[PDB]
Amino acid sequence: EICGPGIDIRNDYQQLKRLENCTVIEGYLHILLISKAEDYRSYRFPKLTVITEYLLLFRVAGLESLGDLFPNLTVIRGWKLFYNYALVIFEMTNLKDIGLYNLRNITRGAIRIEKNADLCYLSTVDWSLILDAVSNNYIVGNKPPKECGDLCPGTMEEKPMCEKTTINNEYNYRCWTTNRCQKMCPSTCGKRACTENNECCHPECLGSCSAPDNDTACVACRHYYYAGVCVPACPPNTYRFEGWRCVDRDFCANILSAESSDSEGFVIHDGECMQECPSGFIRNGSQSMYCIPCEGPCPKVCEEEKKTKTIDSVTSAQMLQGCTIFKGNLLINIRRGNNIASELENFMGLIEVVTGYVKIRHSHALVSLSFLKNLRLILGEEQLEGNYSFYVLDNQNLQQLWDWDHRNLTIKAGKMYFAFNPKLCVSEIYRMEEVTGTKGRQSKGDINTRNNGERASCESDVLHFTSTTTSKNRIIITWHRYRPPDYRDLISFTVYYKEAPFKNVTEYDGQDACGSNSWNMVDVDLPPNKDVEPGILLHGLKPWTQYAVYVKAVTLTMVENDHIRGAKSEILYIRTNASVPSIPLDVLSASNSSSQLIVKWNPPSLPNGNLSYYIVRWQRQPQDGYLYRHNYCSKDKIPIRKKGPCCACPKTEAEKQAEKEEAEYRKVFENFLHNSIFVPRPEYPFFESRVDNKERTVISNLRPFTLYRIDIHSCNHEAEKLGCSASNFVFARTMPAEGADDIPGPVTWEPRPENSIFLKWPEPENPNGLILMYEIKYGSQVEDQRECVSRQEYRKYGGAKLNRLNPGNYTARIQATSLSGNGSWTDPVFFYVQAK
Amino acid sequence: EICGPGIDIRNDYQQLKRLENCTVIEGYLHILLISKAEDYRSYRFPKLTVITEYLLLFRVAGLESLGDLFPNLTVIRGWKLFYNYALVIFEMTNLKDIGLYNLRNITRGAIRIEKNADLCYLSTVDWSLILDAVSNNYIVGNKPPKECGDLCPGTMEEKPMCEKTTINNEYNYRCWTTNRCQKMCPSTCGKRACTENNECCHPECLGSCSAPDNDTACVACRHYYYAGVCVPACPPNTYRFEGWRCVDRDFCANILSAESSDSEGFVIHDGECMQECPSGFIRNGSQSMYCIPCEGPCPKVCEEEKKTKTIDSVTSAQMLQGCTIFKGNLLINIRRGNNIASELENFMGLIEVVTGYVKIRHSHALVSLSFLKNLRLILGEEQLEGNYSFYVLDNQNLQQLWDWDHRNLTIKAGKMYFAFNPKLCVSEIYRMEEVTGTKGRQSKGDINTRNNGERASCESDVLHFTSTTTSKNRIIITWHRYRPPDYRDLISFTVYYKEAPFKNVTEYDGQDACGSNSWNMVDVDLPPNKDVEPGILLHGLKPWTQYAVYVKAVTLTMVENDHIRGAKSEILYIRTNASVPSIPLDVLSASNSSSQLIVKWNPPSLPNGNLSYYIVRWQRQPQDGYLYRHNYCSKDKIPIRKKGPCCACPKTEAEKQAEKEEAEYRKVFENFLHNSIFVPRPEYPFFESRVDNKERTVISNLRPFTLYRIDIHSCNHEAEKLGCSASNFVFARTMPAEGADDIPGPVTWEPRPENSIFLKWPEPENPNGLILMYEIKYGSQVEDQRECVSRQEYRKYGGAKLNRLNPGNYTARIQATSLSGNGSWTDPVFFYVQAK
Ligand SMILES: *[C@@H]1O[C@H](CO)[C@@H](O)[C@H](O)[C@H]1NC(C)=O
Ligand SMILES: *[C@@H]1O[C@H](CO)[C@@H](O)[C@H](O)[C@H]1NC(C)=O
């Protein structure tokens, strides 16, 4: 009664007759696309009890309650899911109740029951009892809930004996259809199943059983079904068949291609009767039991149903991702594409062995077959007419095959053809004949000497750099006077150039399959005089970066073809530096402590050389005489006037252009600025301390409260010859001498006529910045009166005067205003004024 | 004393000695880059009173108050601004007060006084009095306001002498420096200026005057200064010189040049002596009295200081934007670039005439010179060695020059040279020897039949389409069995194809880079049997396009070169029913009125046709017998449970990929769905009304409250042969018959034992949807009691019963529950029950 594999039924009812003998469908089931709606409940399948894989119903016109069709379906194992679901009820025409009243558990996956016009009864199905991970149920698109009309026993429906369960605060009835309920085993069983009338089943059991605690009575087992018994594990000498049972070796190996393409054999590995042996293992020949570990080719086979898997785009190779051996032949016709190689090395650079030929055709977008790295041997079993097993035709742009210094290859059962590839010279294939054991397979016509590699120089010479010279933004370079076999041949020179901090760079990469793409181009012609060797003036170059350069003599390949040698000097690299750095960046600092200033900045933007060191000058700056001449005791001044949470909150992109224009205009101001800021350049002393390597430093031994102007010059290695960079500067203050703002000596009080008192006192020894004013607080009972004394006032009188005071005793105090802030109040000053 | 042009001073003080005689600097002034700080207030220039243009001070070390150096600077005209400013004080080293105490008004532009370390006194300058559009003033970066120290006469100690003005709620003093204030003319003058001690000046006046209301006494005029008098307009026979005066024509022409100057001689136009005459007009020789309109685009010279303005990039041509005639020669070396042409037609497609030669070299990124449209004649005054005035060298990809069906050209004073252009066929240049009057000017060597157009592509024939078989997503196309001069030549056939709804299409639209990227390539080989003419099966074509096609016979050009004839069929434009048609989309509708329903949808996605028509089938759908058998008087049901928008951003759904897989799985379901939803297809009746051309329609004559199922078919031009397309559908309800829910007949009451009352009544004639229940409201004094009667209850009894009522009289009412909603209440029903 074990129907397998999964069953498919569409377009009509009568195919249902194939399910008469099926009890546990070993696979999935499709009952779909039945538009006729011809028949009704004349097909019934009580035997069907469990589906191993998912279920899918769709457009089964004329179906109203699945419980009519499939009763007894206790559990769905759902080992293979639809997408992540084990039951798909998509847009059902006329289904009214889901039925499935005998359905008890869904081991795997979720369900999707949407778009059903008139379907209902989904709500009262507490899938928590039946299904874990219930949150993934997708039942949105069906009938609106108000028109659902969900009624069923217990909740005021006939045969009311439904039970009440709770899911998220809803302790109420559960059910399946109008007639019948949704019952669940009591907690007495725990995880164990049960039967009708609450008789608890066997532990190794699930869904239901015929008698309490009987191995053979179980309608469905819990984990594995074998020998008509539910077992917790596969018995010895038996191997787990997929899903829910064990089988003998002989059964595991006898099964062959039936219905779907089973194919010969069915492996056994790790104690399980699997289909094909897992990674890191290989089945012992055709002996259908065993495995042994392997690597590389063994882990994966790259065969294709097509004998010729041709590739015309990166996506065309997707199926070949992570594969090694193709049991067939290859064919490439990739005409256009950029970045394609970087993805060909990934999709199908793992290819190792090939059972046939390989062919390359009209591959204008490719320049080097090096992207085929893993290939080691070619069989040639499948070979082209003329016995050609490696065909390369009409490739205008191909340069050179696999790197032939360390990489080996072999073509076993055929020859190769080459033609119509003017950038691939014979030197790249003549060596291959040595390396793939194929020197004598073919004549020289199969690799024609006329149209192959015609354009390719093969080989270019190397020019000599007669002189070089750097600047701060410019480099002047020259080369030997190249003299071809016929001088009229050469017509010009090109002087490539680009920033290349790292020597790991070569122009033969082909840039954009040749030139362009970040090798900035410039040209210059040979000067008319034959006595002056070529030179140019590259300029505007970014300071502080190593610059690779090479020279190519563009020539005219005609008449004699390869005899036109071509010319290309070595890839020299030159520093920018006859140069003067472009000042620091992001200069900042603070005063962690008095006499201490921590200074930290960021590297200069265009510093004209390479990492050598920095230089910092700092000068004590004057306390402006301005503030001295001011009586702050009377000055008061007056102020004058006239995605982000901001939501959309845009700003004119033309306003960003305006800001760009303003910044650019400022920078051009700076450019015209620093021309005569430093003409041609081939009250305190300045203190200097050259930083070594890093963008940080600290200066000590500074006055507690003196402001410092900090010039910060970036100086390069060539700074000795051509001076140092211009100056970015910043001013900063030290942390005030703490407690230096308190009074150093006592106060003195003297009587004066008209009930007056003169107060005198000493002055701070080392005031922090400056003493702006003195705040005398005094009074008879409470020191309410507060008066101000300017520094000049104190200087003139050594203090101040208070006039017209009332009779009585008095206490007073004084505080100073340091440029750092308030000073400490004076100690109490006791005095008295007599009425007469 | 009129110093001109603008004055420039840098790097030292002694250059200030060029300002003794300068009263009104006719131009701008730069006093910048003075780092020496050598001298102090020994240079004084009381004469300087006004600057016509902006002023720029920067890096003037040793300067502390500008007012000392330049007193009496009454007004700045600022006709030409720095950026949009007439005064720039950027990083003023040591300036303390801006001075400018005698500065009163700024005519044009704003000021930028920023990032000065110690500058102050900006606040007390009410720029509203001096400056309009004052908002653009930008003074952010200078000394912090707290350390500014902004004080001046009056506001400090001494009796006030500055006047009080108000800007944005601050009515207080205004001033310039510590020694002097910022005085302004009283409102008595209105817009008129004034003198000291408040004597009002002349109307035609500004800044200041020496006596009240005197033309000759004005320190500065208001609009124009001429003949030692301020005037509101230029006097007749005199012509406005730039800015602030008039001049005689003799002077206008005698101003030849000085350092930075052009004309030599200024022209009088529109009543003003300008440098050059404006657009649409031409100077007639050396004439300077007047300027006459020219006519068309003559008025734009495109000369360059360089005799050879070479272009290597689009930006390299920027300066030539909007220009017509180049007084020199052209040189192009644009090797790489895409979209470049579309911008060359803009930057330099306006070029009309050229005074010399033109040269093209190494232009691999260009294929057609049509982008130079406006050129009509070439002079050749500047000519190359060998008298070559038009040179085209080393251009691999050039195909064809300007369009020669209608566009003319002439080269006057030289010949032309070509070479190394294999894709430019000689036909494009042989015609030129006719069109530019140069047929015999040069030998054929300069136009050698060799390397010139060497490769190109011969001359294409046209293939013939033997048959064009079709499908609903697939085309099968063929062509005559092409027979080259030598059969081994041809090696394959490529079949270009793309979607091209519009006839405006040609070969080079989207092929590759130079051909652009829109033509989806494919290749196919001739079948082995010579008796079967070539054919291909194109497939998977997106519906709704006139699917363009063409054929090119790829060959092996060699040995005989041009004799290799090549080929290309016509650009046929096969369309749908080659892609035979399909289904609808996007269905929506509503019911504005009873028996009326508006239907509107959108154009379909995949119908494989063209606008032909739509079809809509609507079927009355059943009022489910389900709801009939349900007593809703007692049914209650039970629910179950368990910088942009990120100002309120909920989340970022980076799972867009996961939605991608789910949606794509949905479409794969749909594809395997409609594969066999409709097998091979080469209680109410359905009603039909084919729509004509649009995506809208309406249905009438429908039951007031019946639900309708609407199938929609994208029936089309060829729906007759291969059937109509799949049916998207939707259900919708009509608007209920309003007022049909009220009772049609009276109620009747009867006595019954046990103090009971039986109520009977008629039933609605045409209920909307269905009558679910009846709400009887009744009571003795107030109809408090409300009871429910099901439709089946009424059917069985024609009404209902009330039992065990108290003695007394009673009034009652009844309301019906239509599927559309509540019905109208019954008229009052009067009855009574007696205790016995
Ligand atoms: C079911 O089994 C019976 C008995 O072997 C057989 O006659 C019948 O054809 C089978 N039908 C199906 C659908 O398996
Ligand atoms: C379904 O059965 C398995 C194994 O017996 C059990 O672990 C799972 O809990 C059951 N379903 C639910 C929803 O618990």
Ligand SMILES: *[C@@H]1O[C@H](CO)[C@@H](O)[C@H](O)[C@H]1NC(C)=O
């Ligand atoms: C100013 O004018 C006087 C008198 O003509 C002349 O001697 C002197 O050189 C002039 N200086 C300048 C800077 O124009």
Ligand SMILES: *[C@@H]1O[C@H](CO)[C@@H](O)[C@H](O)[C@H]1NC(C)=O
């Ligand atoms: C400057 O003078 C012009 C013309 O006399 C006048 O229109 C303008 O208002 C003056 N400046 C201000 C700020 O008003």
